[PDB]
JSON list of C-alpha atoms in Angstrom, two decimals:
[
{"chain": "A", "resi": 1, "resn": "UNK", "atom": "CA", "xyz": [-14.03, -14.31, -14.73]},
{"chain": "A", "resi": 2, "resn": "UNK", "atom": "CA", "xyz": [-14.54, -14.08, -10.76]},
{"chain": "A", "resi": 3, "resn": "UNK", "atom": "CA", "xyz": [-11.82, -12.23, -8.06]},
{"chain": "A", "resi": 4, "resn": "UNK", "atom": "CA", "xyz": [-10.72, -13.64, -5.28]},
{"chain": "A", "resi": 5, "resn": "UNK", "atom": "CA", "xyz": [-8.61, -12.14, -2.26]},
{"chain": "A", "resi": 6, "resn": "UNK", "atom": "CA", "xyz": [-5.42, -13.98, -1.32]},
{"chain": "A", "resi": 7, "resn": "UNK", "atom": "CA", "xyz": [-3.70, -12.49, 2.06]},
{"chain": "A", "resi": 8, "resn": "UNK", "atom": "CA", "xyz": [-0.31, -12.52, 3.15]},
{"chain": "A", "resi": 9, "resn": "UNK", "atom": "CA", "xyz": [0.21, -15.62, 0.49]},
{"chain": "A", "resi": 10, "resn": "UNK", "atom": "CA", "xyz": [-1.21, -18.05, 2.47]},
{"chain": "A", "resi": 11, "resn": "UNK", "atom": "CA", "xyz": [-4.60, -19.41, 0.27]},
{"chain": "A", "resi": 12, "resn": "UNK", "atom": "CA", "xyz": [-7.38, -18.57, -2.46]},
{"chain": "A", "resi": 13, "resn": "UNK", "atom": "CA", "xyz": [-10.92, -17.03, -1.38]},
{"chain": "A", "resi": 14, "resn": "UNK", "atom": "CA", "xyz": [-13.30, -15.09, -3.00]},
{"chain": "A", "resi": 15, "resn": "UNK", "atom": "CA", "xyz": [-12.99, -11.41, -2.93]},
{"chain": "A", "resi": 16, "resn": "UNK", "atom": "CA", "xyz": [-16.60, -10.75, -2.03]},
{"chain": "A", "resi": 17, "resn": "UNK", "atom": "CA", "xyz": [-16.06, -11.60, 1.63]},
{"chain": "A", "resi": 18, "resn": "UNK", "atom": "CA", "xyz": [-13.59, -8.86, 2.48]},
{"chain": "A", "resi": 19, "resn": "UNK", "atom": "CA", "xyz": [-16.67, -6.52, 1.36]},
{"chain": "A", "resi": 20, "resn": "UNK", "atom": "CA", "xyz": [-18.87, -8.57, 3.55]},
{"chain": "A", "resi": 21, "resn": "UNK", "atom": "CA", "xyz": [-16.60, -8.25, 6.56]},
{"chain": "A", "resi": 22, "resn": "UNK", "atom": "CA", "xyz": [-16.83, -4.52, 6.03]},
{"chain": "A", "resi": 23, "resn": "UNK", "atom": "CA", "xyz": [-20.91, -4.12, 7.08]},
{"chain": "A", "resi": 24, "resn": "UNK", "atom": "CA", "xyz": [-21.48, -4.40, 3.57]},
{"chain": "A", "resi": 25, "resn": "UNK", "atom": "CA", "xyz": [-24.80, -6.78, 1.85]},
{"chain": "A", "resi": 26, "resn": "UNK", "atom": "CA", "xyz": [-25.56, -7.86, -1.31]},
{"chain": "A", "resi": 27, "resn": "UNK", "atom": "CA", "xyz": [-27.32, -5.05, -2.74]},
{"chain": "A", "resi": 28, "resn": "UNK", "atom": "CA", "xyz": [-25.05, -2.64, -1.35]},
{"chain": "A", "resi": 29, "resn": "UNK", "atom": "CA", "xyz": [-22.04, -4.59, -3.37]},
{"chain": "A", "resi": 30, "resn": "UNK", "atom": "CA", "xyz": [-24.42, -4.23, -6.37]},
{"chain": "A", "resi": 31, "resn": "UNK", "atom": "CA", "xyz": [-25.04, -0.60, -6.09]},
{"chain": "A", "resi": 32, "resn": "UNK", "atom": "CA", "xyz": [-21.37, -0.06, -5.83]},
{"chain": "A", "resi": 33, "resn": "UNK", "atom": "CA", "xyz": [-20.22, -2.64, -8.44]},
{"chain": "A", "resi": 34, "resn": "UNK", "atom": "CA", "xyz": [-22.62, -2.21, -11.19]},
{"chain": "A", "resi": 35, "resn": "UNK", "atom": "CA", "xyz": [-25.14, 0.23, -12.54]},
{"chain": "A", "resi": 36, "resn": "UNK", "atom": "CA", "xyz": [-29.10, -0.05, -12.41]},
{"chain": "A", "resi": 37, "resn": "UNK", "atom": "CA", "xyz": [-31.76, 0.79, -15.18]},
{"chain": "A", "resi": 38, "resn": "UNK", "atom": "CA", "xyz": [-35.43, 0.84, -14.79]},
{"chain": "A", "resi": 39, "resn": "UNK", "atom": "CA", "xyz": [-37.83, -1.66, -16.15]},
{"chain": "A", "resi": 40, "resn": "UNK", "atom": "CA", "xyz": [-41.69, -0.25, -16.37]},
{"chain": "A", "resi": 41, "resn": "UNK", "atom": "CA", "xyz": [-44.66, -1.85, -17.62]},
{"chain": "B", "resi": 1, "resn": "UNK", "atom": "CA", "xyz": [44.18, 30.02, -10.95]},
{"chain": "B", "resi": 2, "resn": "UNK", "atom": "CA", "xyz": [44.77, 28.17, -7.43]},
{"chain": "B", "resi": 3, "resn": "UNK", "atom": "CA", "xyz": [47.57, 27.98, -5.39]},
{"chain": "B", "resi": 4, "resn": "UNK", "atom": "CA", "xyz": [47.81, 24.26, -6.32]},
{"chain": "B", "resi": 5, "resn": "UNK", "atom": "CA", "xyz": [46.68, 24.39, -10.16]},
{"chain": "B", "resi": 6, "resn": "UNK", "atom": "CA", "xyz": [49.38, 27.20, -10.78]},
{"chain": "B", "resi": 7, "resn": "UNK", "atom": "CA", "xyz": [51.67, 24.84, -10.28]},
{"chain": "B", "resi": 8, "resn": "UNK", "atom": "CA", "xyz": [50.97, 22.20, -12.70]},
{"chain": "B", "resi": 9, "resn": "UNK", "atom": "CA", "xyz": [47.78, 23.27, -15.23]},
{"chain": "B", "resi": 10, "resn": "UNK", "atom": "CA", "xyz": [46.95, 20.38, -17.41]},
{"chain": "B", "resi": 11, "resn": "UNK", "atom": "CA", "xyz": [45.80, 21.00, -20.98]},
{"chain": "B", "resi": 12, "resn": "UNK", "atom": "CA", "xyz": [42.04, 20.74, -21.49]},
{"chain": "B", "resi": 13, "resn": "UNK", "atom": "CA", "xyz": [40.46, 19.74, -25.16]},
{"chain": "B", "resi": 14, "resn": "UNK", "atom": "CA", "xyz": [37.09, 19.88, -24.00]},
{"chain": "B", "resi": 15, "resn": "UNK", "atom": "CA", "xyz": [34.66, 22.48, -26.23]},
{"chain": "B", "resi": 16, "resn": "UNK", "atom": "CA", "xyz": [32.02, 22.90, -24.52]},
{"chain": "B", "resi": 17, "resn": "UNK", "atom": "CA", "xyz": [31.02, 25.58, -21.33]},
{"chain": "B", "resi": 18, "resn": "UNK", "atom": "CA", "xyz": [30.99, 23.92, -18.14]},
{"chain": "B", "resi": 19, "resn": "UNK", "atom": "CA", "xyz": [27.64, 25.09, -16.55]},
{"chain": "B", "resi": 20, "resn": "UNK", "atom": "CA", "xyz": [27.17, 22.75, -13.35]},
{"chain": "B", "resi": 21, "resn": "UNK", "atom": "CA", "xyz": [29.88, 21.88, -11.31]},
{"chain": "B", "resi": 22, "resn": "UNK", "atom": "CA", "xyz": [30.75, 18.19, -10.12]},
{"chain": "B", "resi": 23, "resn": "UNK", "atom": "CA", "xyz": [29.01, 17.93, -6.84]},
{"chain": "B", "resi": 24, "resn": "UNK", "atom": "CA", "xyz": [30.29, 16.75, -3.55]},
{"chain": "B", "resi": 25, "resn": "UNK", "atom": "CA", "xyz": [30.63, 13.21, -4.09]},
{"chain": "B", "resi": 26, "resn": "UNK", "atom": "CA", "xyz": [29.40, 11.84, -0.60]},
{"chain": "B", "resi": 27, "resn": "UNK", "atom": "CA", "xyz": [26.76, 14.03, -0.05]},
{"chain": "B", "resi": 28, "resn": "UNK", "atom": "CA", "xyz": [24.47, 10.97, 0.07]},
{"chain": "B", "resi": 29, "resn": "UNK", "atom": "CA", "xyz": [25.59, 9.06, 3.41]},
{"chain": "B", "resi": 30, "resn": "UNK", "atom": "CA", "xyz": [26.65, 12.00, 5.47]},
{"chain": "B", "resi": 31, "resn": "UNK", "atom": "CA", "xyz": [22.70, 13.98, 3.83]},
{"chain": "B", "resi": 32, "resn": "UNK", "atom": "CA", "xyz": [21.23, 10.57, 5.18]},
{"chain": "B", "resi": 33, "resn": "UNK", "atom": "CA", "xyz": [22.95, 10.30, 8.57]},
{"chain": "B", "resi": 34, "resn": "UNK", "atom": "CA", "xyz": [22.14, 14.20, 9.33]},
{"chain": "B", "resi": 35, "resn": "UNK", "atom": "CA", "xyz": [18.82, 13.40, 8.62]},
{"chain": "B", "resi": 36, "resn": "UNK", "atom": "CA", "xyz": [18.95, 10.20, 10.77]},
{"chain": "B", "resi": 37, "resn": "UNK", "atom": "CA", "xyz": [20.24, 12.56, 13.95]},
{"chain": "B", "resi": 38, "resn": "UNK", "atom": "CA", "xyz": [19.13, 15.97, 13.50]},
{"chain": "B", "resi": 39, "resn": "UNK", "atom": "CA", "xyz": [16.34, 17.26, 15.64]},
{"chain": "B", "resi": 40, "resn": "UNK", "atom": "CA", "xyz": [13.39, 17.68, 13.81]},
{"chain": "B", "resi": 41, "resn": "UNK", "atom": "CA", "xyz": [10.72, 19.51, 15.07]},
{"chain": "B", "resi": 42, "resn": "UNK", "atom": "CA", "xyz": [7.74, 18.26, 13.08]},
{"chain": "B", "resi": 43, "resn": "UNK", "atom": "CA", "xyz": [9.13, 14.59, 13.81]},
{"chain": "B", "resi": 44, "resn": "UNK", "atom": "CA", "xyz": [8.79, 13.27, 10.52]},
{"chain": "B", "resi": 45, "resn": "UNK", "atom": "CA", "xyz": [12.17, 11.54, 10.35]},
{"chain": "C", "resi": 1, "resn": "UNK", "atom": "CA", "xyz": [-28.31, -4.33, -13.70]},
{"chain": "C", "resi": 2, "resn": "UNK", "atom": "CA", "xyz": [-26.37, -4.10, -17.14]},
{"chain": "C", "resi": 3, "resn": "UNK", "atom": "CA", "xyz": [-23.84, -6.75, -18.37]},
{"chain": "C", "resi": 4, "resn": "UNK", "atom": "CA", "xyz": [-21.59, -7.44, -21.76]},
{"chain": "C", "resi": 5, "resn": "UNK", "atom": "CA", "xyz": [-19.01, -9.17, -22.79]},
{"chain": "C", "resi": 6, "resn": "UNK", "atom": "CA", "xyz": [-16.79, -6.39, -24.13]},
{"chain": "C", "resi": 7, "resn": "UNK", "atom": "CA", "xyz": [-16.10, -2.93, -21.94]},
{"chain": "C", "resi": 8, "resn": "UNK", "atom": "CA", "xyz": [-18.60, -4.99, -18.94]},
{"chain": "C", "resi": 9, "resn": "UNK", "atom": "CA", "xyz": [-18.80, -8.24, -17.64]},
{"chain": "C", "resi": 10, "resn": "UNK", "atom": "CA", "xyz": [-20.40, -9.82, -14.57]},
{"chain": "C", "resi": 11, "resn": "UNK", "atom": "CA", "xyz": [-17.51, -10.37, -12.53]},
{"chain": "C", "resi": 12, "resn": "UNK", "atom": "CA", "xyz": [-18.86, -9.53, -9.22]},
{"chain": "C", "resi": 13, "resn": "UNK", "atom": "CA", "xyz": [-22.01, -11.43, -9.62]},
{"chain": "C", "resi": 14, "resn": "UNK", "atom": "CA", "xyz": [-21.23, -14.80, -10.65]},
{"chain": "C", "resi": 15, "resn": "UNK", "atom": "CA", "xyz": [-17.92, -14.08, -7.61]},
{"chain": "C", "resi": 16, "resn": "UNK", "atom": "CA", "xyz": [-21.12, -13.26, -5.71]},
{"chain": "C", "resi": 17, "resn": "UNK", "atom": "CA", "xyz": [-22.92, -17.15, -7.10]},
{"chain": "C", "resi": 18, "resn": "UNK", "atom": "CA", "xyz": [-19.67, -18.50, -5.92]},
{"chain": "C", "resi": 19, "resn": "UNK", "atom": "CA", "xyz": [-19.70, -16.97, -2.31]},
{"chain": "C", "resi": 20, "resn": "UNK", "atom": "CA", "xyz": [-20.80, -19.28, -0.04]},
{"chain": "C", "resi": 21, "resn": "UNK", "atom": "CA", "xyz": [-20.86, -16.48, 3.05]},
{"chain": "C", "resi": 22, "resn": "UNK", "atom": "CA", "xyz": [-24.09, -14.94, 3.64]},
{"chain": "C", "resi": 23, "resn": "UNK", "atom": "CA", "xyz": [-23.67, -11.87, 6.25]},
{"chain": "C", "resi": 24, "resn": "UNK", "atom": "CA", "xyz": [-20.66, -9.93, 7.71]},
{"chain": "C", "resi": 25, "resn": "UNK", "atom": "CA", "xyz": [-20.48, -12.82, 10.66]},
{"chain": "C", "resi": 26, "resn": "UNK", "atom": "CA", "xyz": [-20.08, -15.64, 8.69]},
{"chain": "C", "resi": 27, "resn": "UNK", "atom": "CA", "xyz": [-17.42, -13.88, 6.56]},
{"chain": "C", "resi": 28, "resn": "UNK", "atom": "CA", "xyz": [-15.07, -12.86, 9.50]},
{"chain": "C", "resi": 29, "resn": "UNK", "atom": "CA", "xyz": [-15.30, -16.28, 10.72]},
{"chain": "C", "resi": 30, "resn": "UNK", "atom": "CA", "xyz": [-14.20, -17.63, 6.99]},
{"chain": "C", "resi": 31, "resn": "UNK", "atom": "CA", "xyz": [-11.20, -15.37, 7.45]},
{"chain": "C", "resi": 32, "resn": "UNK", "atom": "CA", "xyz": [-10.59, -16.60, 11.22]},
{"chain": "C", "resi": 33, "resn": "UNK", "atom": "CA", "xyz": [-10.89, -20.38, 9.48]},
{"chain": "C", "resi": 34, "resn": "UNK", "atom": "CA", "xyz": [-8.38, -19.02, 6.66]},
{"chain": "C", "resi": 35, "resn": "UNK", "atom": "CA", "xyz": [-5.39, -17.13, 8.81]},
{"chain": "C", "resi": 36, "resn": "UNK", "atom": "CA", "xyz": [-5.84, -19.50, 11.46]},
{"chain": "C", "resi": 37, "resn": "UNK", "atom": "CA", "xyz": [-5.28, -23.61, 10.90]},
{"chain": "C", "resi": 38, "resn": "UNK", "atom": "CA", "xyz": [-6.52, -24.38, 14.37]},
{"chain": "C", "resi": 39, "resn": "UNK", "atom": "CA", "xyz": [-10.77, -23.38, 13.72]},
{"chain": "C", "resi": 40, "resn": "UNK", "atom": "CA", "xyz": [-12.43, -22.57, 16.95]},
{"chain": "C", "resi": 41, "resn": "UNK", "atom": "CA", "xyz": [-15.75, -20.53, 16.03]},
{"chain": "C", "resi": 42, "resn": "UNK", "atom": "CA", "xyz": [-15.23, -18.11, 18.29]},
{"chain": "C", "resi": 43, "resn": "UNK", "atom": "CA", "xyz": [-17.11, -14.69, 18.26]},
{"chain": "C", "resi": 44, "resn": "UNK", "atom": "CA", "xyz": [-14.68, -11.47, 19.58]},
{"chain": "C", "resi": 45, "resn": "UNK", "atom": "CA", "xyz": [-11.45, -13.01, 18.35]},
{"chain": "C", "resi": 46, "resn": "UNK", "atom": "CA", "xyz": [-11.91, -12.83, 14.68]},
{"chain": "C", "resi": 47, "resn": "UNK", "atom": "CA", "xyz": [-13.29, -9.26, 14.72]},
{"chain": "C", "resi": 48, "resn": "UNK", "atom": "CA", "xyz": [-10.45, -8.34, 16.86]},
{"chain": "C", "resi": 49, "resn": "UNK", "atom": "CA", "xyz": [-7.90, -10.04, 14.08]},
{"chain": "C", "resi": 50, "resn": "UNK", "atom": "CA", "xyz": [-9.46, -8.50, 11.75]},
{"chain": "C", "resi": 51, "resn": "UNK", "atom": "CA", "xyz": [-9.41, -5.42, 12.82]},
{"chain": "C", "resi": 52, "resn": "UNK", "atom": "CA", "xyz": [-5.55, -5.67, 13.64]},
{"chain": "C", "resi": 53, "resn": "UNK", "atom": "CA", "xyz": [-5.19, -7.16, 10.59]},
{"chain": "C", "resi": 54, "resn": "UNK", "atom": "CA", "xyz": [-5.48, -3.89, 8.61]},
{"chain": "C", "resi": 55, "resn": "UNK", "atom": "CA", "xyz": [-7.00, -1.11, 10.85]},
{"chain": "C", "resi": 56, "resn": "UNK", "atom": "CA", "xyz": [-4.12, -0.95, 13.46]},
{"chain": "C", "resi": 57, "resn": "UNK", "atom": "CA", "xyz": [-1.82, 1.53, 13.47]},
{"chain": "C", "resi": 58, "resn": "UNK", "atom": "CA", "xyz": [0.38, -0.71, 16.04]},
{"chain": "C", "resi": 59, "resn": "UNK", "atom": "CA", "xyz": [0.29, -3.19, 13.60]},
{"chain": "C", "resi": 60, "resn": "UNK", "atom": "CA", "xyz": [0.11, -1.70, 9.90]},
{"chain": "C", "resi": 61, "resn": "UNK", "atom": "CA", "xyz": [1.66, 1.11, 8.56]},
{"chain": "C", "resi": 62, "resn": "UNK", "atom": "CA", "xyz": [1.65, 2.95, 5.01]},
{"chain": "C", "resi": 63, "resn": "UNK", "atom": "CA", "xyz": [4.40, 5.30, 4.75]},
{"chain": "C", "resi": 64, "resn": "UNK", "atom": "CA", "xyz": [4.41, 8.39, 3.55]},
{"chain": "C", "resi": 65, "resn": "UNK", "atom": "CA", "xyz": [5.73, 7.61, 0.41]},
{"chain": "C", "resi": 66, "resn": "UNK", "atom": "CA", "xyz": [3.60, 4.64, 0.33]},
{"chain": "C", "resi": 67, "resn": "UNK", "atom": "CA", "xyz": [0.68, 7.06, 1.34]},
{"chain": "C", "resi": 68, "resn": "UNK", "atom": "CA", "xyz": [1.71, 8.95, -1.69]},
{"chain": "C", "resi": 69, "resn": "UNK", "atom": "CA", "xyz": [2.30, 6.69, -3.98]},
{"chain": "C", "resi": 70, "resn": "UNK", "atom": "CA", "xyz": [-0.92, 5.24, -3.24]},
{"chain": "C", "resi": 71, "resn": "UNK", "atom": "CA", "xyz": [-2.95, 8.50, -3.79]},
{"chain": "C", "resi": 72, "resn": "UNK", "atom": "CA", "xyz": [-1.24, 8.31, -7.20]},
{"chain": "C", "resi": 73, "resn": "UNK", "atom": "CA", "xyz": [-1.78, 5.47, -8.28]},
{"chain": "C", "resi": 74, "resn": "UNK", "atom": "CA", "xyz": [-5.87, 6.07, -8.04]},
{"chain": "C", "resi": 75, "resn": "UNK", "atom": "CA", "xyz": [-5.48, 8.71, -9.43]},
{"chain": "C", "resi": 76, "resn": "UNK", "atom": "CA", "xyz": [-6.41, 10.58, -6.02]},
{"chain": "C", "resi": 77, "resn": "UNK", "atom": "CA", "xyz": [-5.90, 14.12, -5.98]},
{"chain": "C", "resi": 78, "resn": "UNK", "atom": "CA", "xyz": [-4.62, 14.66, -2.44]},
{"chain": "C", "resi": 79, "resn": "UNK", "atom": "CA", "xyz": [-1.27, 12.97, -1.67]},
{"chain": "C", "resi": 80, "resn": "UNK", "atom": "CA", "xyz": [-1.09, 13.26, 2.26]},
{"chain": "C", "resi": 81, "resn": "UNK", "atom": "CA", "xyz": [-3.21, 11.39, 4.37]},
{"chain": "C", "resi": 82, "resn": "UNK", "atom": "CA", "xyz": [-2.88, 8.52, 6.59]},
{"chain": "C", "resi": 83, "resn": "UNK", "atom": "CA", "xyz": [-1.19, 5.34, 7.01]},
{"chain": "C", "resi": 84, "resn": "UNK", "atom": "CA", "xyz": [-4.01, 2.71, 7.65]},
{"chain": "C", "resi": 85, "resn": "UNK", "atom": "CA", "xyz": [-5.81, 1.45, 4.43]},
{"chain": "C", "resi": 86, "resn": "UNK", "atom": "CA", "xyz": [-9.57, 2.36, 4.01]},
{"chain": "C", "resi": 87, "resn": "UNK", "atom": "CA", "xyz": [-12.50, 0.47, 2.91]},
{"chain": "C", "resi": 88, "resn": "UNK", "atom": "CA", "xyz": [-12.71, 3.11, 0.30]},
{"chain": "C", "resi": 89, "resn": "UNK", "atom": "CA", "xyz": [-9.04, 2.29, -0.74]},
{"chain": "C", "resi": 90, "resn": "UNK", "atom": "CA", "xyz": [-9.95, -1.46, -1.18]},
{"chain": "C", "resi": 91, "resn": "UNK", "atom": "CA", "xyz": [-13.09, -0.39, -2.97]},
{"chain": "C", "resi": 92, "resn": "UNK", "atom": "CA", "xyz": [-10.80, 1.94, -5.41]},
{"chain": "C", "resi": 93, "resn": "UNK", "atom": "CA", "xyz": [-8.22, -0.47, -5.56]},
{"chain": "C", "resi": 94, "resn": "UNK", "atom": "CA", "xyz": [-11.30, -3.16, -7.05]},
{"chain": "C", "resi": 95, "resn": "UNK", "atom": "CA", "xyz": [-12.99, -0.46, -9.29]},
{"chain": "C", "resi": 96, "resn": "UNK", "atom": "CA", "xyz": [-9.48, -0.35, -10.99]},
{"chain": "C", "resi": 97, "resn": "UNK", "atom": "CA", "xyz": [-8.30, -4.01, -11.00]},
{"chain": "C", "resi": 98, "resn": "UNK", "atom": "CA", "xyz": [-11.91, -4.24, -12.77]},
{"chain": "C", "resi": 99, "resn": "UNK", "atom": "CA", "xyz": [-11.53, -1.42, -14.90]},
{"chain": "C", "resi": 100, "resn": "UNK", "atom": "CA", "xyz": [-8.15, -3.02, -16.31]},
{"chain": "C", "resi": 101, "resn": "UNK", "atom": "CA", "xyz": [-10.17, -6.04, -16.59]},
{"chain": "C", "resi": 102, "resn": "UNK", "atom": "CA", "xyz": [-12.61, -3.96, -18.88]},
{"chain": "C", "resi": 103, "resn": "UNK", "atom": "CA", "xyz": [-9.46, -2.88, -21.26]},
{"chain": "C", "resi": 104, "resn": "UNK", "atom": "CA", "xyz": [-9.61, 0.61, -19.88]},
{"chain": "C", "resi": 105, "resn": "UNK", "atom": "CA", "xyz": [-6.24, 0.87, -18.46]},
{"chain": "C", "resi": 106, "resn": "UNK", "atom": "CA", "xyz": [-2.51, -0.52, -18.40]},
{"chain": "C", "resi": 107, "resn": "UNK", "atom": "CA", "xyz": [-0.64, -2.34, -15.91]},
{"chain": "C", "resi": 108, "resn": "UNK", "atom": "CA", "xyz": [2.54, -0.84, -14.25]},
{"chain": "C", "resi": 109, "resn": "UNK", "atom": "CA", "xyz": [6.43, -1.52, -14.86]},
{"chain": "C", "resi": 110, "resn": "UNK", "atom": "CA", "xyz": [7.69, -3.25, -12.08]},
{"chain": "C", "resi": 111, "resn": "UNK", "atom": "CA", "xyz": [11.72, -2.27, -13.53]},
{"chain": "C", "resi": 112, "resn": "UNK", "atom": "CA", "xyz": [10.22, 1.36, -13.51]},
{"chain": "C", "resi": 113, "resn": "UNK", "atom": "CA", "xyz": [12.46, 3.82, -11.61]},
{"chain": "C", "resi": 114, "resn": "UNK", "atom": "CA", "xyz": [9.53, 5.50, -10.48]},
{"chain": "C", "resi": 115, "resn": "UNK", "atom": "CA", "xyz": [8.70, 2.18, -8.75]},
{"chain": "C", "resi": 116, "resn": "UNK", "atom": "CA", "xyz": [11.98, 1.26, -6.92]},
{"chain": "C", "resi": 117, "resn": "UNK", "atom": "CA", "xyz": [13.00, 3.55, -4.05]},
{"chain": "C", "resi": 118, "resn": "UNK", "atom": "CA", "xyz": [16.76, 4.04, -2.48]},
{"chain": "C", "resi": 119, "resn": "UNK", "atom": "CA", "xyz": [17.24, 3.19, 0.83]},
{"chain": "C", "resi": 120, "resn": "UNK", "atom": "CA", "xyz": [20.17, 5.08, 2.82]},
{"chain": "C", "resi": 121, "resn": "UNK", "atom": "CA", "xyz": [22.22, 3.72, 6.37]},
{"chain": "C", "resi": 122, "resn": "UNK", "atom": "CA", "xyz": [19.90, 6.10, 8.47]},
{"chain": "C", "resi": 123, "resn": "UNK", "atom": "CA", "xyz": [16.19, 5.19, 7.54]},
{"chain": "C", "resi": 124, "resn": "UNK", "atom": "CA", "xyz": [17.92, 1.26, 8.41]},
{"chain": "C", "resi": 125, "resn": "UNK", "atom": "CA", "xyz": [19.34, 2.64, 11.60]},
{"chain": "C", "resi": 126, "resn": "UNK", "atom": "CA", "xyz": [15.97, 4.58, 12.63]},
{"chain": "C", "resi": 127, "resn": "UNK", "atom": "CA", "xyz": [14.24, 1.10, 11.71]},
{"chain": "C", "resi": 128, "resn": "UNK", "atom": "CA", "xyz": [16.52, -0.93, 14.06]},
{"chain": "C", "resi": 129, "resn": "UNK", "atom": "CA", "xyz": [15.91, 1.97, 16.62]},
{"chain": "C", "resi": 130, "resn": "UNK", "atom": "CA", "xyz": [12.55, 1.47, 16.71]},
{"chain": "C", "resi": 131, "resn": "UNK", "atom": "CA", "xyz": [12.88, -2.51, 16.49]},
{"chain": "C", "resi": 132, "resn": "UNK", "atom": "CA", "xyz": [14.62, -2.25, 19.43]},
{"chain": "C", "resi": 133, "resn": "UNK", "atom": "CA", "xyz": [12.26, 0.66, 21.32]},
{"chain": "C", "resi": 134, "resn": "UNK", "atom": "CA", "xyz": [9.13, -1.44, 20.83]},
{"chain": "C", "resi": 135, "resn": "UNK", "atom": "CA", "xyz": [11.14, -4.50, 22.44]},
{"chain": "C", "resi": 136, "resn": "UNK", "atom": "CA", "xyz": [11.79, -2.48, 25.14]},
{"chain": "C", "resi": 137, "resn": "UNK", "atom": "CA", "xyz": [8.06, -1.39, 25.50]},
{"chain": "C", "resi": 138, "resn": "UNK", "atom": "CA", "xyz": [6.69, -4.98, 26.31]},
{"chain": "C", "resi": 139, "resn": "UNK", "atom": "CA", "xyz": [8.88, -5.28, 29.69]},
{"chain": "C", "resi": 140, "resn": "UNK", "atom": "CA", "xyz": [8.50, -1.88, 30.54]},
{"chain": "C", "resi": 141, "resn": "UNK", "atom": "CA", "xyz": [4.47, -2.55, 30.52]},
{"chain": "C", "resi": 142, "resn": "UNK", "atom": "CA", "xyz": [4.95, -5.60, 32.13]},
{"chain": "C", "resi": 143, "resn": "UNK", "atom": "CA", "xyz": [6.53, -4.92, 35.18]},
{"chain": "C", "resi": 144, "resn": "UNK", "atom": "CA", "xyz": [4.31, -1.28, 35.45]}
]
């Protein structure tokens, strides 16, 4: 269970580098992909 | 009647009221090649 | 973050584990190395491919049915717009490819006649028009 992003039919590659080429980093991806909860102690 | 029905009327055995005429039947080419070279103002097609 | 293995699922992460790029250069130079066999590392050429590839209007185009259709699909409100995809179309595009994923959702009917369009002898004629305008257009800058 991983996506990838295949372009004009031409080969595999993982679908996190087209948000990479947009400006976008890691935690950024996160934030958009997923939701946070808060761990105290 | 018409002119060219009064001359010959054929028998009909349908029962039920005709509401929506038959329409044109090549409206779609000559719709499509208007469209083609119409002016159009707003330039969408 | 949260994770499960029934309406969630880590499918950006581990894709994320399996990226080997590590910032927005080394990315568009993976996609350079991809769409091009010949692999010079260059610098301005990939970014300017890149940005051709999907952000030109000279070279990409969604209709405006496509446009429309589009909106629909996402279930986006607003069915003008324009004809060059977004990052926030790829984004929503993702979210629902995902949210499929999660069982929340159905795929489409490709046999659909909501999903096949008619095509009439002038949109082919306007298409050849402009085939043969933007032939005309390289010679014409040329010899200016």
């Amino acid at each position: 269970d991983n996506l990838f992003v295949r372009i004009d039919r031409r080969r595999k590659l993982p679908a996190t580098i087209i948000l990479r080429a947009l400006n976008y980093t890691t935690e950024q991806i996160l934030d958009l992909f997923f939701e946070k909860v808060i761990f105290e102690i | 009647y018409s002119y060219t029905e009064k001359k010959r009327i054929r028998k009909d055995f349908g029962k039920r009221p005709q509401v929506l005429d038959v329409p044109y039947l090549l409206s779609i080419q000559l719709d499509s090649f208007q469209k083609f070279i119409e002016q159009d103002p707003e330039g969408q097609y | 973050l949260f994770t499960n293995d029934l309406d969630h699922g880590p499918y950006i992460s581990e894709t994320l584990r399996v990226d080997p790029t590590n910032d927005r250069l080394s990315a568009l130079v993976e996609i350079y190395r991809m769409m091009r066999p010949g692999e010079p590392p260059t610098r301005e050429a990939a970014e300017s491919l890149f940005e051709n590839l999907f952000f030109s209007e000279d070279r990409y185009d969604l209709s405006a049915v496509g446009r429309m259709k589009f909106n629909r699909s996402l279930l986006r409100e607003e069915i003008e717009g324009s004809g060059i995809l977004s990052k926030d179309d790829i984004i929503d595009v993702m979210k629902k490819l995902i949210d499929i994923r999660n069982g929340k959702g159905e795929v489409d009917d490709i046999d659909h006649l909501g999903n096949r369009r008619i095509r009439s002898v002038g949109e082919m004629a306007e298409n050849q028009f402009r085939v043969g305008l933007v032939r005309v257009e390289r010679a014409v800058k040329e010899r200016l």
